[PDB]
């Protein structure tokens, strides 16, 4: 009755099925969400980018925040592809921050472990921070990407 699995699920659910990165708010404003991309599609898709997430106050945005006038509909965006890494793309009207350091808007940046993005800068009382959790499993699969498969 899902009783046993429930035990394993809470203690540590099976993550990495197709999980790219996870967004967690540290300032306590937006609920945690899970970003993901299909591995088969990533390997099969030999293009520039595979799947990109858009975050902001927009209901369309892959990430819906609470309601910060300082933040834009789509404050920031995350792209997944290249080869076996992740990139962060800022897209806010006010700007996107990384550990206190403001990055170039609509610019691609190299992913960081447990990285954190700050937004709504201008007023110490109007800034919101977000933490990114990268799936170790995803990194492992990406490393092997296409299995040799011994015929």
């Amino acid at each position: 009755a899902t009783q046993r699995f429930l035990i394993e699920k809470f203690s540590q659910e099976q993550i990495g099925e197709n999980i790219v990165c996870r967004v967690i708010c540290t300032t306590g404003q937006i609920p945690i969400r899970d970003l993901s991309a299909d591995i088969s599609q990533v390997l099969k898709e030999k293009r520039s980018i595979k799947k990109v997430w858009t975050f902001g106050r927009n209901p369309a945005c892959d990430y819906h925040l609470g309601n910060i006038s300082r933040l834009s509909n789509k404050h920031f965006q995350i792209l997944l592809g290249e080869d076996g890494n992740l990139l962060l793309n800022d897209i806010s009207t006010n700007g996107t921050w990384l550990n206190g350091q403001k990055v170039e808007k609509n610019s691609n940046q190299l992913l960081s472990q447990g990285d954190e993005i700050t937004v709504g800068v201008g007023v110490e009382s109007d800034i919101l921070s977000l933490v990114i959790f990268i799936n170790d499993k995803f990194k492992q699969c990406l490393e092997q990407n296409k299995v040799d498969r011994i015929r």
């Binding site: 006038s69 300082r70 933040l71 834009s72 509909n73 009207t93 006010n94 700007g95 201008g122």
Partner: peptide, 13 residues
């Protein structure tokens, strides 16, 4: 009315 995102005007400091 509109809904322009409140953005500062400090020549992007």
């Amino acid at each position: 009315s509109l809904e322009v995102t409140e953005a500062d005007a400090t020549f992007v400091q």
